């Protein structure tokens, strides 16, 4: 339904799709340099949608290994 | 930011938000002001709660990434403006720190 | 078509007119920059500057001689007054030749963009030189890349960016020197 490249197309945005390229380079790395590429990886925040002014509702993320491959 | 020892660091952007959101402002537009850090949605919801829409937090407790800033660029894409507006204070020294707002086109 | 005369300096003389007159107008990400597109000059003759960035770190900003960019048409190469380029790379090599000496470095994709004013300005995520990679475990995941595709239509596409990847790299660990 969107027209466009192969993430495009597959509701993607661009972001995602580089950052799981940039997710998939990490894992094939050196090990003095593998570990230290896990800290520049790894997402640790929270979101919260304020529909009213003063509501709630959110979605924390603990995530280390890196932007999620799977659906969003 | 998230903790508040800052020195009313949090206020000056807060107060530069308005400064920016009643200028840019010529014809009624929509316009939904996003903070990230703890400290804003206590400090917006002052000014505009009417469109105060989302909260980041926790950002800084273990490090700033890209892929961390993606994923709130890509919850700000959801809804799709046709421009961003970024309020945040440039570190220039230890000393001055200019506030700077940096503009991204749709 | 030019409904909004925008700017840095128009945006000061407006914003004197909103915002209380105590306040002195925000910064804006051109008064931190020097070096311009449209700009004339940057290119004196054979090396040609060369910003090539990540978000965590500056890689390169001294100027090469050649620039081998992995687009996704194909690798090209970019001399000093290349002509205007906006390029998406696909994962591969950049080659930072400065002369008889070159450094290889694999990135992960992410464009690159050369300025009328002969400045290169590579701008990828993740640029891992080649010396830090291991050949071992690329096509240990490759393999399994090459094995999972469900009918996760946005898996689709990231086992698609999972195949292209490590096949490049499978190709650009084989011929080193």
Known sequence: ?72 | SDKGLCGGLNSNITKYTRATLATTESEGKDVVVVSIGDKGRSQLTRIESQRYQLAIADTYKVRVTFGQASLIVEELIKHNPQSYQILFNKFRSAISFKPTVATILS | EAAAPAGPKEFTEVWNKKAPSTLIVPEFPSNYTAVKAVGEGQVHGDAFPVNFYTPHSILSQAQKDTVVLPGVDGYFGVKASHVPTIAQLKPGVVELHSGAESEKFFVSGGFAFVHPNGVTDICVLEAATLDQVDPAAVKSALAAASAAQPTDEFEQAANRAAIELYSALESAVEAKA
Request: charged share 20%; proline share 7%; net charge positive.
């Open chain 1, 1 to 72: 339904a969107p027209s466009g490249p192969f993430y495009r197309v597959a509701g993607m945005s661009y972001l995602r799709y580089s950052n799981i390229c940039a997710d998939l380079l990490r894992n094939v790395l050196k090990e003095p340099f593998k570990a230290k590429a896990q800290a520049r990886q790894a997402i640790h925040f929270r979101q919260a949608p304020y529909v009213d002014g003063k509501a709630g509702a959110s979605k924390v993320y603990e995530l280390e290994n890196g932007i999620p491959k799977t659906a969003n």
